Design a binder for this molecule. Sequence first.
Ligand code: BOG
Length: 332
Amino acid sequence: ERPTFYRQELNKTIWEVPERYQNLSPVGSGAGSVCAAFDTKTGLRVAVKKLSRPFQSIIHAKRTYRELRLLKHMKHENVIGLLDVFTPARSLEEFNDVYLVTHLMGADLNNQKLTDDHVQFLIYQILRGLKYIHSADIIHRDLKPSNLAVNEDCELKILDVATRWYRAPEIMLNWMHYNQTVDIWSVGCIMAELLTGRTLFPGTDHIDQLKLILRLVGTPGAELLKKISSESARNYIQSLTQMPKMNFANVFIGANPLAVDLLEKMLVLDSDKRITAAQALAHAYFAQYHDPDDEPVADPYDQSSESRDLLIDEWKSLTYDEVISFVPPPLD
Ligand SMILES: CCCCCCCCO[C@@H]1O[C@H](CO)[C@@H](O)[C@H](O)[C@H]1O
């Protein structure tokens, strides 16, 4: 049955939401607008995002669909999920607005070294979430402290200048064919910063970022240089003065040797040689948290919906179908 909706003017528009969602109050970007609310059915504080111009163009429509589909797929403790999605529309013909409801997250990992035991717990949770995302054949591509939410029990969820500080070197070289370990590079950068209280590679601009990375991990070795299809890349690298990888033990002074060992395995230039999320969860650094019985994988996720060129009304109809078919997660 259809919930009774009410209407209220918020962020220059009339929002129309199920009455279960009370005390709406703005907090949000625009890069759709977000309101905080209290969900009375579940007892939870939530974020309610009214999408802005979701079907204004083919590009907007395809974006909306892909975003909804992703959020509907993600069902893991360490990944943001969808609590609800709704529209006031009673039919496709009347369908214009989409609203997404998620847990209201109070803090992120930006929000001043952490202790080694806390770094262990936070990075464990990131990697547990990443194992799940990667198992769906999804690459996050923009892992950074602001995309990591934590609650007051230090339970963590991976979220949905934009800073370059956490970005894998191959993304900044426009390499394409990205591996999932682009995300492992980011996790390394985050872990280093939690341990030291300092940004590992605080690049001022695009080339400076690359310069800082090369300073720590050294210039490419022969095995990596063999895999560079680009003639221009190859000839530039060969001309750099050969520098060895720095000693992470004497870069992360005071740090748990198990942590340094893990960082050495994450922050490798060659993406094929970086540790995977599932391998990292088995690393002795996480001995106190690691449990193979509860590090679950995802169902396969279909991203083909993505190479396709469809009409606006087709993307719109497909999005409508996803809104109607939505099943809320268990009351928990
Ligand atoms: C001057 C800085 C050079 C940075 C080298 C980064 C190499 C990243 O690693 C590479 O990434 C690709 C994308 O997955 C793969 O196709 C390769 O097999 C791999 O070597």
